[PDB]
Amino acid sequence: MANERMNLMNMAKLSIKGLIESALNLGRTLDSDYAPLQQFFVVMEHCLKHGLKANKSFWGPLELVEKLVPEAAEITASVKDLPGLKTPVGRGRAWLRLALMQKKLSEYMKALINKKELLSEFYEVNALMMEEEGAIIAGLLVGLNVIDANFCMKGEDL
């Protein structure tokens, strides 16, 4: 099960590389409908799913971040107090996108890998988040702190 952590990482380098470059070559705030950006989350999602156990999906591991990095308490409670967001995976995809904005996504991730004694509750013995690739990516996520994207959560004019 190492041929998967290898694909995911080299499937993250591109997703991350391409985004950081395009984003900088564009020079303007990114919107949700930005292919290179959405493609990142698709991958970022898969990476966090790989190795999960027993349905909070990857939303469960993310709920730990607040206890580790208090600076994350806010966005963690902003996805909960947000109607229209049913599924847990939804609270997860919503969480990531907010971190991308806070430019703290990289910090939260690192805060987890260095606490495997906690992930072991949601991930198998050797999930991407429990191995080397989990760090290589946590470090590449530092280049996304220069990403100024703005995602829409909801709106109502009636």
Side-chain angles (χ1 to χ4, degrees):
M1 186 179 259
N3 287 56
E4 297 178 358
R5 303 199 302 288
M6 187 172 274
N7 284 50
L8 288 172
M9 180 179 80
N10 296 299
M11 187 175 92
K13 292 184 179 180
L14 303 182
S15 297
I16 300 178
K17 181 187 64 182
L19 169 53
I20 297 176
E21 300 180 303
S22 297
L24 295 174
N25 295 304
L26 196 61
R28 72 177 190 65
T29 295
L30 300 176
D31 62 62
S32 67
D33 295 57
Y34 188 59
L37 179 51
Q38 296 191 65
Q39 197 69 299
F40 161 68
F41 291 100
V42 177
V43 175
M44 189 62 264
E45 183 188 305
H46 290 185
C47 299
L48 289 179
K49 284 188 173 182
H50 181 292
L52 274 176
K53 303 193 293 183
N55 190 59
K56 293 183 178 180
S57 183
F58 67 80
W59 156 252
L62 301 176
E63 293 184 300
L64 297 177
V65 174
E66 59 180 358
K67 284 189 174 183
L68 300 175
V69 181
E71 184 179 58
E74 55 178 299
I75 61 175
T76 298
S78 296
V79 293
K80 300 179 182 178
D81 301 63
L82 179 56
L85 206 61
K86 322 300 172 58
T87 68
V89 189
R91 283 186 168 65
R93 299 195 183 74
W95 196 78
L96 297 185
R97 293 180 173 57
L98 296 185
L100 204 300
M101 292 186 90
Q102 284 199 302
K103 298 172 174 299
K104 284 293 177 296
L105 179 54
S106 50
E107 185 178 307
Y108 303 140
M109 292 301 100
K110 290 186 175 182
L112 294 177
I113 60 174
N114 292 306
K115 292 294 182 179
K116 298 186 179 181
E117 35 78 61
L118 286 175
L119 297 308
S120 55
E121 168 185 54
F122 301 114
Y123 297 76
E124 294 291 56
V125 59
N126 62 308
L128 188 173
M129 293 295 275
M130 307 280 274
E131 295 292 60
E132 173 186 297
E133 294 65 54
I136 309 298
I137 304 172
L140 299 176
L141 297 182
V142 183
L144 301 179
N145 292 53
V146 69
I147 304 298
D148 301 63
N150 191 302
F151 313 84
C152 298
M153 311 303 268
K154 189 177 180 179
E156 181 182 306
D157 299 302
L158 294 178

